[model samples]
Target: GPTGTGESKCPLMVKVLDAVRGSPAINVAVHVFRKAADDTWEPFASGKTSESGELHGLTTEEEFVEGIYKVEIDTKSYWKALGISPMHEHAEVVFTANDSGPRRYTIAAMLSPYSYSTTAVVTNPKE
Candidate 1:
């Protein structure tokens, strides 16, 4: 089906930090994808992490649909930038969008030189 406007707008927010010390992972590459109707995933948005190690407002066509979504982090690139060999080349978090879910979805990851972990949460939009 084609995209449509509704009150179920959901935006993705991603945050990356150090797993051990909880320090921000600044300037890391982040990519977002949405699963299309044909079952193929398409790149929706790409951006570098901020000084705070966070990237907000990653959306497809200004909103999100109820389907599968993926967030990819360039862990190897980040390690290379710091002159360290990355234990893990990359990391990905996949989730589903729901109409009943919060208006703003947050995906937070804690990364180390060798590994990474992530959590997802939803929050209502502020009035």
Candidate 2:
């Protein structure tokens, strides 16, 4: 599953891990936004992640064309629920997609209440 499509059919995937618990973050909501022509970020899609931390099926490749996008990981509530306060309201994975061609993005977040670190595993599939 680490080197393959696994369960993801969508072009974008997000995973959130809890540093406090040293485990997968549960009930974490992930939001997606796309930059519109008018320079506004329109709500693209959103959903909660799995118990294993992975969130898929949020967007398809046909709809996720060349554009700027943002993945918002709701870390506020995730940390608050554990009686800890987070520095930022949420975690952001802002990026430009499809600059070359069709591709996939897998965002991995390792977070603390003070701050969070994120990285995107970009996969280019042969078309």
Candidate 3:
């Protein structure tokens, strides 16, 4: 998913949204990670959707440090807790940002037994 063009100093922002039909097998949680130069992943942020299936403000304005980053949403625990049929428990998004102008980046996902979809963005931050 591509974030449209926008102008801002902290142009890079990421989100993990889940799309599942009806109720889920169990509670789900999302984790965000930033890739270090050493090919390692560092925890940056985390969130869980509400009963309404919404998790807003998951990413803070100061957390989008300049670097390669990604988001991983875990659904395995949620499903296991419910004792429902198994399904893909993880979703990942990897992206890069340069010294260009400000930019906005986002990642949206859909989790279902039949289909899945997602969207993200790479945009210039608002000046």
Candidate 4:
């Protein structure tokens, strides 16, 4: 389950792996956003996955707030870059941020051209 404390020392970390093949989905575009009271999604951060299929520092302590959060991936662009036809144009993982939970949090995605899944866990950076 996705869990994190209201106060954290580090930013949220995200990792994306290729489940269809085998390896990290390198250079995939990732975007993070927080849902506002008006139901509008506000962009928090955006970046590309690393060679290790990870996007670190997605959001700072100050940027993370208690609300609905989303991580959007450009699956089509990634498949196009790999010379494969993507099953989905985009992939999204939506979760809630809880201020009463643990500190740091990690969200991971296992993705294929046609499908994707996500997992979130509470983490402690001080450890």
Highest TM-score model number:
1
In candidate 2, which residue ranges exceed 4 Å CA deviation? 2-9, 85-89, 98-104, 115-127
> Which one wins by lDDT: 1 or 2?
2
Q: Per-residue alpha-carbon lDDT of model 2 for 1-127, expressed as tens digits?
A: 7866655554667778876567887778788888888988888778887777777667665354665777788765655564444444456887775566535566677665564423322323233
TM-score for each candidate, following the candidate numbering: 0.67, 0.65, 0.54, 0.67
Model 1 lDDT per residue over 1-118, tens place: 2566432223566778867567888878898888888888887788887766567556556344675678888866676575443454566778776645644465577776453422
TM-score of 3: 0.54
Candidate 2 weakest lDDT stretch, 10 residues: 117-126
| Candidate 4: Cα lDDT at 30 | 90
Task: Provide backbone clash counts, one per model.
Answer: 0, 0, 19, 3
Order of the predicted models by lDDT, top scorer first: 2, 4, 1, 3
In angstroms, give how far residue 66 of model 4 lies from its true place. Answer: 1.1
Weakest lDDT window of 10 consecutive positions for candidate 1: 117-126
The predicted structure with the larger lDDT, 1 or 4, is 4
lDDT of each: 0.65, 0.67, 0.54, 0.67
Please give me the total number of clashing residue pairs in predicted model 2.
Answer: 0
| Higher-lDDT candidate of 2 and 3 | 2
| Candidate achieving higher lDDT, 3 or 4 | 4
